[PDB]
Structures are given as structure tokens and as C-alpha cells.
Amino acid sequence: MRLTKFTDLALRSLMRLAVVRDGDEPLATREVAEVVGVPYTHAAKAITRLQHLGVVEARRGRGGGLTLTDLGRRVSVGWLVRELEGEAEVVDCEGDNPCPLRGACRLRRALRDAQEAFYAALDPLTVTDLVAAPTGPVLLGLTD
Amino acid sequence: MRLTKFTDLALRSLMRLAVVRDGDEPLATREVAEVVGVPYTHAAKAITRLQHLGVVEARRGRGGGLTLTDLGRRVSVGWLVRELEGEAEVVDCEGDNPCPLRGACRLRRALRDAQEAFYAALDPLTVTDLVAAPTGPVLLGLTD
DNA sequence: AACACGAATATCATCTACCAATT
DNA sequence: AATTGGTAGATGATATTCGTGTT
Ligand code: SF4
Ligand code: SF4
DSSP states (O other): OOOOHHHHHHHHHHHHHHHSOTTSOOBOHHHHHHHHTOOHHHHHHHHHHHHHHTSEEEOOSSSOOEEEOHHHHHSBHHHHHHHHHOOOOSSOTTSSSOOTTTTSOHHHHHHHHHHHHHHHHHSSOBHHHHTSTTHHHHHHHTOO | OOOOHHHHHHHHHHHHHHSSOTTSOOBOHHHHHHHHTOOHHHHHHHHHHHHHHTSEEEOOSSSOOEEEOHHHHHSBHHHHHHHHHOOOOSSOTTSSSOOTTTTSOHHHHHHHHHHHHHHHHHSSOBHHHHTSTTHHHHHHHTOO
């Protein structure tokens, strides 16, 4: 059981954008992707996703890059992981070869509850929490 | 975020073995794999794993198949999912391209706690619970 | 001088098949 | 008449790339 590199990459991007100095300069996607150490092209897809979600402002030209939106700073990590991962079932009951235990599986209820426990354990935290010490100092130091 | 078909397949096998009538006849791996609808060869690897864990008795010849061990009926689903999935991190921080936020990532602590919440939501249930109504009746009906 | 949107290419983690060795 | 242990082919999900179209 593992989170997509898409989701973790997008959260890296959100954190980098969250440590930015208030009104220093908008960040180009390349510089964020290189600071957090991910391929630029994957980061750009994550940026388009985050922009659709409303957490990241992506100025498109004439001077301008990436800004953390008001929303971006107060949204919870649980909501972000739900929207970036897609809350898809933790098991593929109705795949190409569906399980005969559909419609009367207590394991499916159990795994439903466990996945909700995961997401709810993420639900309190915001992105400002994720960039508190010692993470914030590290991200800032990494800009050189 | 998805559970391996190995783990879900093995839990299907455990459930099928749990509904077996007390001293009816030991189950061949083929008949279990076909009742629960998984490829036989994958099921055999899961069976070897379960036997190493001590939950499944696999008589090797001269007449004999699969039995749920005393342990098998009282073990928790959380323990089973831990041993079959391997408690590997839900993110690959030290992969081929390690994250620069190792050693000072609050997201890693958050995801650690969320994964523990998952496993602990599974920790109460046993395998006898998973085959209670309506699952047990369905598994039994499926034997024809 | 950047971000967005859609079509492949690559990759790798697991799904799966298989042969030989017991028993 | 079955289960076990090591070896690759299969696969499909996603990690990644890229070209064109805005802006
Ligand atoms: S055993 Fe239950 S939870 Fe697992 S794949 Fe089948 S229906 Fe889904
Ligand atoms: S951002 Fe944190 S949790 Fe994510 S891969 Fe990097 S160190 Fe791990």
C-alpha cells in the first residue's frame, strides 16, 4: 500500500510554495520542481491539478509563476490526499475478474473503515503545520 | 492507494477455509482458488506465505489439503494485512531519487500516523468476524 | 517565458505462469 | 495428488515526456 508519487510530489510543491516569503517573488514551476527534486513535467501536471483544486494560483505569463492561495494554507492534508489520490477503493472488487463476495463482504466494510481512519488521521493537519519546524527551516535552507 | 491482490486473495482463501465444516474434508488449493475466483498459481504462493505465517495447515501429500489452524481463526485482520502487505512506508522517501525532506518531514510523521490508524482500524476484527453473516452464507452457497 | 491540455513512451511493482524438488 | 521454492514473461497502473495551444 503506497501513495502515488503524484500526490506526494504535489504536497512537496504545496510546502515549497508555503514557505515562500510573503510577496518575495512568484515561483516558476521549474525552480520548485528542482528544489523539491522531482521531474519538471510531472510537477507541471500536479500544478495543473492543484490549480483546478483552487489551492495554487498559476499566473500564465507576462511575468508570474506560482502562489499559494488563501485556500491552500488552510486546507487540510486529508482533503488534499483525497482529491489528489481520488478515494478509490483500497481493493478492486469489480475488476476484470470481479470477486464473488461483492454485496456481502464484511472485509470490504472493514477496509472502507480503515481507509476512512487513514483519511481522518490526516484530516486535522493543514499545510502550515507541515511546514512548521523542522520542515520549514529545511525547505528554506534548500533555496540557494 | 491500493492493497495488493496477493493480500486480498490470501484473505479470500482464509475466509473460504474458515467456513469449512468442522472435519468435513481438507480443501485442495485448486478448489479454494476456483471458489473464490483467483488464479491457482497466485493462490499457491499466498498459501505458502500463509503456511509460513502459521495460520494455514498445508498437508503436502498422501491425502490432505488445506486446514485453518487454531491460530488462523483467532488472528486479527490487522496482523494479517501487516504480514501480507509488509508495513512498507506509504511513500518512497529513499527511492531511486530520494526526497531532500528526509529527516525533517512532518508529512512523513503524518502519513506514519495515518497508516497506523488504518492498521489499528483493522486490528480488532478476526477472521471469524469476516465470515459472519452475510459473508459466511454466501461463501457456503458458493460451494457446489 | 510561462502554464494547460491531450497522446504516447517508459518503468516498475506486482500479477502470473512454470519447472523441478519433495511428501 | 499435493505443496514448496526459485525464475523469469505479463500486465497494467502510474511516472514521465512532449508537442501544440493559449496567455
Ligand atoms: S474479498 Fe471482499 S473486499 Fe476483497 S476483493 Fe472480494 S469483495 Fe472486495
Ligand atoms: S515530502 Fe516527506 S513524506 Fe513525501 S517523500 Fe519527501 S520526505 Fe517522504
